[PDB]
Amino acid sequence: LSAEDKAAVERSKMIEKQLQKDKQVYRATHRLLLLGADNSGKSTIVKQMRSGIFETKFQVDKVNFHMFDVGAQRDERRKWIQCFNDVTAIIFVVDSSDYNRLQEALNDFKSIWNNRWLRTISVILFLNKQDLLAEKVLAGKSKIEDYFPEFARYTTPEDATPEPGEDPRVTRAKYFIRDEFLRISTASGDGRHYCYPHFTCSVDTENARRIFNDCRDIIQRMHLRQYELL
Amino acid sequence: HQVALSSISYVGCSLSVLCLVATLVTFAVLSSVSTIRNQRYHIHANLSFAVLVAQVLLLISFRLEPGTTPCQVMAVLLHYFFLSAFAWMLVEGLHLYSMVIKVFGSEDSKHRYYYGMGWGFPLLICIISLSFAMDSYGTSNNCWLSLASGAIWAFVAPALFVIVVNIGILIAVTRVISQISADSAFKLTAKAVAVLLPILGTSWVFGVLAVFQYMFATLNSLQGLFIFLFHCLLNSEVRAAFKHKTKVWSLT
Amino acid sequence: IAQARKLVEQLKMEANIDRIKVSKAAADLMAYCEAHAKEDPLLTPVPASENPF
Amino acid sequence: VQLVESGGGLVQPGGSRKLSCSASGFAFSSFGMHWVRQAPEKGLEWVAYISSGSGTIYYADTVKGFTISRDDPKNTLFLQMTSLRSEDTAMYYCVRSIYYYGSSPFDFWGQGTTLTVSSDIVMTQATSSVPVTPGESVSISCRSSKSLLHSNGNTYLYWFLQRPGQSPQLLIYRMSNLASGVPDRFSGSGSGTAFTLTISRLEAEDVGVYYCMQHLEYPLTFGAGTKLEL
Amino acid sequence: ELDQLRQEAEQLKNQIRDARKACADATLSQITNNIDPVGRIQMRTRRTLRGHLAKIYAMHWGTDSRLLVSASQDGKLIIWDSYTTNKVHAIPLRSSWVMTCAYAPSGNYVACGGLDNICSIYNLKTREGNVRVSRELAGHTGYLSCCRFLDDNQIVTSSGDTTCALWDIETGQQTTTFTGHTGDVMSLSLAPDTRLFVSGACDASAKLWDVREGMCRQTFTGHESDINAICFFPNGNAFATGSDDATCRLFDLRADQELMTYSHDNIICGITSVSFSKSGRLLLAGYDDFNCNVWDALKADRAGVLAGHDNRVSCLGVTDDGMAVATGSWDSFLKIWN
Ligand SMILES: CC1=CC(=O)C[C@@H]2CC[C@H]3[C@@H]4CC[C@H](O)[C@@]4(C)CC[C@@H]3[C@@]12C
């Protein structure tokens, strides 16, 4: 080779060294796709732990998480979601106060759970109107049976946990929505991806802790499946 | 009666050679697919080679005439080959712990302690054992390490340690498997134990304990068979890689 | 409203283009492929002398 | 883009001097650096080279054991003179040179600092007193003792211009390509072992000394130096 | 009223279809059953380029047939030297979801873009010596899918806002805007004369636009799913479009027709990239079955297969001299075949 070819090889090796350094950072950062709705409080969840895409980088147990709010995009998604075939989780935020726009939210988990390029990708569910849900269901104006029939033929499952004791007719109100989403996420894609539900409020803290726990579980399951364990 | 413990050991160890040769051959053939380029398959291949060279050496052992000239080199090379195997089991256990228990900070490359714990520390231990006492390698009768003096400790202390850790880690990895299975509980945990038996070496406890001799022989002679079955034939990643590469070679 | 008028104008624009027979411009492709065939390295593999790769 | 330097003056034959070069408006951490000497009323000669980052350092057959180092954070190239032989009383010029495909090595030059002190492919430029008048055409010839034509088909002849009381400016790189920000009236031609540089319509700003460089073997050899006396 | 306008539009569409059918005399197969076959074309991986961190989403060939640009959705834009498998440049990106890249014909600028809504033009020939964002283009309310360079000062982009845009780089504004697409435009191909360009969208259509202050000249339909690749014929009188219905179709600019379809019963995946050889005899298409297929562009049949990839093949390209074919896939690898 010539001198100007050896120097080019050296420049390429330096580029490769920098690329190695960047790959160390890239592999240690877990990318989350924050996919909610207009009525959902995703814009407040991102603010509490704080055109195009919006990147929000945080860190809980010295572990870097990189949330990506999809912003100025059209009303169709079946194209750019292919870019998120390698993300750790899809954080789906649903507002529970608006019962009317919950069937529409219902027929969006199915478009994510049952869509290719996403069979190895799990969904973290954030129902983000708990205080608003309680305020609505303590009054009589809110009527779950009205918007959603078949609510009466449903009881709070044995696995229930009112956090501050909560209040009857409220825990069932949350758990009907939880069960509906988990039924959408249950009878499909068994053994490749799982749904993690969490009740939360927009101003509530420890939401990043919940994301950290769910990411821990997702990566644990994927690593177990890398072996012939399950 | 030492009449069947030899034939069972010989047939098992002989099938082990073929199975591990197949394991390394298939891991080298499917070394281009991105799914088989990780520290995990490096550990699998290295442990496979270590057990292969240990079992071939033991098969040569069963027939080599005792003495001093071939026997000494044979014995020394049958310590840095059943100790490197044990160190690679320990490396596999540590990687499993840093992958199922501590799930974060695992994708980072650490091909320095793994190749230092296996193919490393075994050499240091063998060097110090040779320095402390060299005549204990010759022994008498059967050509092995001294199963009469403290020289066997240089093998039984590094081994019994690993077996302990590879038990405790196993317990952890089972408990998680229990909790995940507590979302069939007796079905998934049993399969996990079966898959972890060959790489973690938890079937060697009978060596410390010793009817049990037959179990020891039948379990640690087919170690290569179990590795080949549960990490080269029943593994979904390797199966998919083999399918893809066969399709590639068919179309190319 | 305006979208319908825009679509009507668009369809009117593309409906007034002189279209040639498919028999022609199908043999033109064959003519351009018969020529330039000697200049296509992938078609006829150029020997290792003229091959940067 | 400025590549100034300092650290010269009068040095006794004891052989102890440090001489540095500070660059501003650069990518100094990603660009190769050269030290090039010019004896008073004599020709040019190549002293030293440091690659991108470090790890590739070359010296001449005279200055070997004149160390040269780099300081990326402060953008400073350092030269340590361990000897003060009387033959080293040459002006020292910093040279910026980057080596990738299509690059233009020896693009920008500093401003020399004078420190008065009290295999080797030969470049021949015999003519040194070419008389020309403004508006005419000039042709300078340089010759190579070897063939400056690697198997990759890349000639490695460089043409430089040094106007009186000024630092050398890049004119032609690789015998055919014009440097950035130079008049199009300059051109370079050749076929190996012999090359020429043609100037058409001399505009009185081309008066100076012209130099030819090899870049095949890292011992870089200079031409004699042709002067257009005008 | 609205019904009258809809009836007029339906009548216009029916008239266009009738004119196309009437102009249809002979198919491509009938005028190609006699020419000798191209034979079993067997290329091989000469250079494999590695260094990217994540999936490669786009690549473009420099006009010198030597330099390469590859975009990876780790947020990187790498300029390679294909002859010597060397990394000429490594450009970090403000965003990390890049779906397109382009090399200027001169080689002084490089285009980039993606989900960030902005087309970034990077200048490779600064005096400072480092590639720098020369101009950021905003005005797209959606992800950029494909960008192409006409000259050193004009760029052409397609975005997820169902629009194309011709930008003046110096001013940073939209010199022209192309509307008429009812879905995300994914790829566009520049004509050799640089006066027209085709653009394929997710509404199962490909439209031809006039760059010099024009609108949609022709519309081409026939794909059963989203068109996610496009490439002009070297003559500029035809173009090939790849859709995720396992079909690459050839359309002729002078007749508004579908000349041929390149499909097999054993291929059910999508088609991500499409390209042409220098002579036009070969049509190259990368598929989602980790495979690249080369087709006899005259007699529609499979001519050869390049099967060296371990994940979805995303981008394809053929050098200006036809020397090699570069394929970039989701295993963070680009491979050169010839
Ligand atoms: C005890 C001991 C010490 C050595 O350093 C090497 C010796 C190799 C032969 C090995 C022998 C082969 C089949 C027998 O079950 C077993 C395992 C008993 C233990 C012997 C070793 C491992």
XYZ file of C-alpha atoms in Angstrom, chain E residues 50-314:
265
model
C -19.190 -3.745 9.139
C -19.182 -1.156 11.892
C -22.784 -0.045 12.232
C -24.481 -0.434 15.604
C -28.104 -1.051 14.602
C -30.312 -1.712 11.592
C -29.244 -0.080 8.329
C -32.226 1.757 6.871
C -30.835 3.457 3.764
C -27.744 3.697 1.596
C -26.676 5.616 -1.500
C -23.859 5.269 -4.028
C -21.551 8.138 -4.858
C -21.243 9.194 -8.473
C -17.626 7.963 -8.546
C -18.841 4.351 -8.117
C -16.457 4.086 -5.154
C -17.852 6.065 -2.212
C -20.831 4.839 -0.203
C -23.155 6.393 2.377
C -25.021 4.243 4.900
C -27.601 5.375 7.456
C -28.128 3.407 10.660
C -30.894 3.967 13.202
C -28.416 4.256 15.959
C -28.052 7.824 14.727
C -25.106 7.332 12.371
C -24.197 8.221 8.787
C -21.051 6.386 7.646
C -19.217 7.176 4.404
C -17.333 4.080 3.205
C -14.731 3.486 0.514
C -16.054 0.328 -1.108
C -12.819 -0.617 -2.884
C -10.748 -0.812 0.320
C -13.518 -1.425 2.934
C -12.444 1.811 4.618
C -14.510 4.244 6.691
C -14.002 7.674 5.139
C -16.448 9.503 7.414
C -18.621 8.883 10.480
C -21.287 11.558 11.024
C -23.341 11.558 14.246
C -26.949 12.689 13.998
C -29.072 14.885 16.246
C -31.909 12.388 15.828
C -31.566 8.607 15.978
C -34.353 7.350 13.675
C -32.970 7.899 10.167
C -34.915 6.437 7.256
C -33.069 7.978 4.292
C -29.691 9.189 3.077
C -28.349 10.549 -0.191
C -25.033 11.402 -1.817
C -24.826 14.587 -3.849
C -23.651 14.105 -7.452
C -20.712 16.421 -6.789
C -19.851 14.626 -3.554
C -19.640 17.767 -1.414
C -22.884 17.303 0.543
C -24.779 14.396 2.083
C -28.508 14.288 2.825
C -30.107 12.674 5.866
C -33.558 12.479 7.394
C -36.071 10.398 9.268
C -38.659 10.607 12.041
C -37.221 13.983 13.123
C -39.293 15.740 10.389
C -36.161 17.584 9.175
C -33.884 17.010 6.176
C -30.285 17.607 7.244
C -27.677 18.542 4.630
C -24.133 17.908 5.847
C -21.129 19.555 4.201
C -18.194 17.193 3.653
C -15.768 19.834 2.333
C -15.392 22.458 5.037
C -12.094 24.141 5.825
C -12.514 23.155 9.486
C -12.070 19.522 8.455
C -15.131 18.059 10.191
C -18.478 17.210 8.632
C -20.941 19.799 9.902
C -24.692 20.225 9.588
C -24.750 22.741 6.750
C -28.519 23.203 6.611
C -31.556 21.851 8.451
C -34.767 21.800 6.412
C -38.033 22.056 8.336
C -41.505 22.208 6.855
C -42.451 18.543 6.850
C -45.117 17.521 9.367
C -44.104 13.879 9.149
C -41.166 11.543 8.871
C -38.847 11.919 5.906
C -38.673 8.698 3.899
C -36.414 9.505 0.941
C -34.217 12.410 -0.157
C -32.385 12.959 -3.437
C -29.929 15.558 -4.724
C -30.444 17.345 -8.034
C -27.407 19.620 -7.705
C -25.331 21.095 -4.892
C -28.092 23.588 -3.999
C -31.434 21.825 -4.627
C -32.806 18.793 -2.784
C -35.915 16.668 -3.305
C -37.657 14.953 -0.389
C -40.654 12.726 0.306
C -42.272 12.725 3.733
C -44.862 10.939 5.818
C -47.106 13.991 5.445
C -48.136 12.552 2.055
C -46.130 15.244 0.249
C -42.912 15.751 -1.672
C -40.870 18.932 -1.487
C -38.187 20.572 -3.619
C -35.935 22.679 -1.386
C -33.404 25.398 -2.097
C -30.587 24.621 0.331
C -29.245 28.187 0.522
C -32.559 29.760 1.525
C -33.678 26.657 3.415
C -37.222 27.041 2.068
C -39.540 24.899 -0.043
C -39.109 26.080 -3.616
C -41.893 23.711 -4.674
C -44.345 21.366 -2.962
C -45.827 18.263 -4.603
C -49.233 17.207 -3.282
C -51.686 14.617 -4.530
C -50.705 11.583 -2.476
C -53.232 10.004 -0.103
C -50.624 8.210 1.996
C -47.035 8.124 3.129
C -44.588 8.454 0.244
C -41.754 6.035 0.960
C -39.320 6.228 -1.968
C -38.653 8.494 -4.927
C -36.333 8.075 -7.908
C -34.634 10.844 -9.866
C -34.641 10.738 -13.644
C -31.209 10.764 -15.329
C -31.909 14.140 -16.963
C -32.986 15.543 -13.555
C -36.232 17.105 -14.735
C -38.765 14.504 -13.589
C -38.979 12.102 -10.677
C -41.253 9.235 -9.679
C -42.513 8.736 -6.131
C -44.196 5.661 -4.656
C -46.561 5.813 -1.700
C -48.570 3.596 0.636
C -51.792 4.202 -1.310
C -50.589 1.558 -3.811
C -49.555 4.191 -6.333
C -46.565 5.870 -7.949
C -46.803 9.412 -9.312
C -44.522 11.211 -11.775
C -43.677 14.832 -10.941
C -41.958 17.559 -12.951
C -39.238 19.191 -10.856
C -39.112 22.463 -12.819
C -42.267 24.007 -11.352
C -44.722 21.246 -12.119
C -47.346 18.861 -10.766
C -48.290 15.188 -11.112
C -47.874 14.270 -14.774
C -48.935 10.614 -14.556
C -50.214 8.182 -11.941
C -49.441 4.457 -11.951
C -51.493 1.871 -10.066
C -51.648 -1.902 -9.931
C -49.860 -2.875 -6.735
C -51.991 -4.641 -4.134
C -50.179 -3.119 -1.143
C -47.772 -0.392 -0.058
C -44.985 0.600 -2.455
C -41.799 0.962 -0.415
C -39.151 1.107 -3.156
C -38.708 2.661 -6.588
C -35.993 3.040 -9.221
C -35.851 4.579 -12.689
C -34.808 2.756 -15.826
C -31.458 3.972 -17.215
C -33.293 5.368 -20.248
C -35.626 7.230 -17.907
C -38.554 5.856 -19.928
C -39.505 3.177 -17.387
C -39.306 2.490 -13.682
C -39.566 -0.453 -11.296
C -41.618 -0.324 -8.096
C -41.457 -2.814 -5.229
C -44.354 -3.418 -2.865
C -44.953 -5.494 0.237
C -47.101 -7.923 -1.725
C -44.035 -9.791 -3.046
C -44.262 -7.949 -6.374
C -41.866 -5.717 -8.290
C -43.604 -4.142 -11.282
C -42.216 -2.379 -14.354
C -44.057 0.674 -15.697
C -43.401 2.537 -18.948
C -43.433 6.333 -18.867
C -44.603 6.707 -22.476
C -47.683 4.451 -22.233
C -48.907 4.632 -18.591
C -48.896 0.855 -18.238
C -47.528 -2.056 -16.227
C -45.116 -3.810 -18.578
C -44.231 -6.800 -16.399
C -44.586 -8.294 -12.924
C -41.743 -10.089 -11.131
C -43.395 -12.499 -8.704
C -43.004 -16.136 -7.723
C -45.345 -18.444 -5.849
C -42.543 -19.242 -3.379
C -42.003 -15.609 -2.299
C -44.532 -14.218 0.180
C -42.508 -11.541 2.000
C -42.320 -7.868 1.094
C -39.910 -6.048 -1.191
C -37.898 -3.335 0.539
C -35.499 -2.106 -2.153
C -35.322 -2.183 -5.944
C -32.542 -1.319 -8.375
C -31.509 -1.642 -12.009
C -28.327 -2.692 -13.759
C -26.515 -0.397 -16.168
C -27.880 -2.108 -19.280
C -31.394 -2.580 -17.887
C -31.384 -6.354 -18.396
C -31.215 -7.069 -14.650
C -33.694 -5.944 -11.992
C -32.374 -6.312 -8.443
C -34.735 -6.405 -5.469
C -34.129 -7.006 -1.777
C -36.814 -8.929 0.085
C -37.865 -9.483 3.697
C -36.852 -13.163 3.520
C -33.245 -11.994 4.069
C -32.656 -12.494 0.345
C -31.824 -10.483 -2.751
C -33.244 -11.568 -6.104
C -31.951 -10.609 -9.550
C -34.462 -10.921 -12.382
C -34.221 -10.946 -16.156
C -35.935 -7.605 -16.726
C -37.117 -8.593 -20.225
C -38.350 -12.166 -19.743
C -39.890 -12.051 -16.288
C -38.168 -14.933 -14.518
C -35.724 -15.345 -11.670
C -32.133 -15.002 -12.857
C -30.210 -15.376 -9.611
C -30.192 -15.102 -5.844
C -27.829 -13.411 -3.390
C -28.523 -15.020 -0.027
C -25.762 -13.912 2.309
C -27.841 -11.836 4.734
C -29.108 -12.786 8.188
C -31.948 -10.253 8.504
C -34.303 -8.103 6.454
C -32.600 -6.535 3.448
C -33.446 -2.832 3.559
